[PDB]
UniProtKB/Swiss-Prot annotation, chain A:
Entry keywords, A to Z: Activator, Cataract, Intellectual disability, Methylation, Nucleus, Phosphoprotein, Transcription, Transcription regulation
Family: Belongs to the Mediator complex subunit 27 family.
Compartments, record wording: Nucleus
Residues bearing PTM Phosphoserine: 118
Stated name of the protein: Mediator of RNA polymerase II transcription subunit 27
Assembly description: Component of the Mediator complex, which is composed of MED1, MED4, MED6, MED7, MED8, MED9, MED10, MED11, MED12, MED13, MED13L, MED14, MED15, MED16, MED17, MED18, MED19, MED20, MED21, MED22, MED23, MED24, MED25, MED26, MED27, MED29, MED30, MED31, CCNC, CDK8 and CDC2L6/CDK11. The MED12, MED13, CCNC and CDK8 subunits form a distinct module termed the CDK8 module. Mediator containing the CDK8 module is less active than Mediator lacking this module in supporting transcriptional activation.
Disease link: Neurodevelopmental disorder with spasticity, cataracts, and cerebellar hypoplasia: An autosomal recessive disorder characterized by global developmental delay, impaired intellectual development, and poor or absent speech. More severely affected individuals do not achieve independent ambulation, whereas others develop some speech and can walk, or show regression later in childhood. Additional features include axial hypotonia, peripheral spasticity, dystonia, cataracts, and seizures. Brain imaging usually shows cerebellar hypoplasia, thin corpus callosum, cerebral atrophy, and hypomyelination.
Known outcome of mutating residue 246 to L: In NEDSCAC; uncertain significance
Taxonomic classification: Eukaryota, Metazoa, Chordata, Craniata, Vertebrata
Curated annotation (Swiss-Prot), chain B:
Entry superkingdom: Eukaryota
Source organism (scientific name): Homo sapiens (Human)
Lineage: Eukaryota, Metazoa, Chordata, Craniata, Vertebrata
Protein name as it appears in the record: Mediator of RNA polymerase II transcription subunit 16
Entry function: Component of the Mediator complex, a coactivator involved in the regulated transcription of nearly all RNA polymerase II-dependent genes. Mediator functions as a bridge to convey information from gene-specific regulatory proteins to the basal RNA polymerase II transcription machinery. Mediator is recruited to promoters by direct interactions with regulatory proteins and serves as a scaffold for the assembly of a functional preinitiation complex with RNA polymerase II and the general transcription factors.
Family listed: Belongs to the Mediator complex subunit 16 family.
Quaternary state and interactors: Component of the Mediator complex, which is composed of MED1, MED4, MED6, MED7, MED8, MED9, MED10, MED11, MED12, MED13, MED13L, MED14, MED15, MED16, MED17, MED18, MED19, MED20, MED21, MED22, MED23, MED24, MED25, MED26, MED27, MED29, MED30, MED31, CCNC, CDK8 and CDC2L6/CDK11. The MED12, MED13, CCNC and CDK8 subunits form a distinct module termed the CDK8 module. Mediator containing the CDK8 module is less active than Mediator lacking this module in supporting transcriptional activation.
Amino acid sequence: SVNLEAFSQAISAIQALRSSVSRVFDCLKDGMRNKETLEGREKAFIAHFQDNLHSVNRDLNELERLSNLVGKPSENHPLHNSGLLSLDPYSQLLQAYKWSNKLQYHAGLASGLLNQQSLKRSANPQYVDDVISRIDRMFPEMSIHLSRPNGTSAMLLVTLGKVLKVIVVMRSLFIDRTIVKGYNENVYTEDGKLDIWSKSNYQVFQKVTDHATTALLHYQLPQMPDVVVRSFMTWLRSYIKLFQAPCQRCGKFLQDGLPPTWRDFRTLEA
Amino acid sequence: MVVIRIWGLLKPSCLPVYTATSDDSMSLLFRLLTKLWICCRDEGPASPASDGLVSRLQPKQPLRLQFGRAPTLPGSAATLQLDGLARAPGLHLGACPTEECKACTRCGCVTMLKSPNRTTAVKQWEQRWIKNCLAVEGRGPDAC
């Protein structure tokens, strides 16, 4: 239900249409201020005429969209507000709703713009890992698992559409010491005797491994490990296609990908 | 008003109220003005039922009248000095438009009209105003 944007657009469109026709009619009250050379006011006249055409076209385009609204308006939710004045002190509800939404938007914008901090320095539990894994596992198309046969340290893997699974063995909170493979080439279930590491591939995913290592040394936030691993997995998910290759053609090299800024492009160029 | 009314009877393109109900206001206008005339000829009343009835304003009120006049030299008693440039602050065919569109002949009394008058057969007015106008010592011209 995102039709609110199109409806606000239509509001702006009709307001602009009214303003434009009013200004057009007001400008026709007088001729050229001081031409002294020609009657080039016809140019501005044709410009206003085209603006009217633009307005008509926008009105038509918005009439084409915004098909219809659903029946039973308000979905029976404010029936309490629709109720008699006996139970309604009801407007207080909408007031608090608007206040909460405004405060939320304000806090979000403030936090976003506060990213450029001014802190010159920063000075004067085997239960969060499972919780974080459970939270991250709720995400779709990206299945994870963990066995941890080494010890206190964490050992886990992730899966994707293909069989290009990734082996990530890190500490309790922050992700480090990761490696990548492709199409069961690792076989890290019972490799040799157990879930082996072997730190290797067939000389193709080495670039992907280097990129992931660089990313691990880039998304290393001072705190909030949940946000850290979320950024990590979002970065990982950006390779589900490996088909497009902007800033070049998709033939430059073996592959093309380096999206640390949530946007991929031809590698070996940054 | 009666001669312009007989003119309108002779030709339908007279000067109407220009606001609304243009096609019998002239009748009630004439009636009201005759009422004020009789009520003011021989030491009559001024600005009571007459006032109450004329207090009705039909949807016909026009505005934006010229009221032609010109600035002056208000040097009252002590001092008013003016420079040579950058002056310091102190017919009915328009005579006050928004944009300039002709030679813009200036005038002192009320006129501020066009120099060639850009017309075909109004030459009576132009002829009567060929020479200096009413106290037209300030009958000047100005560009732009």
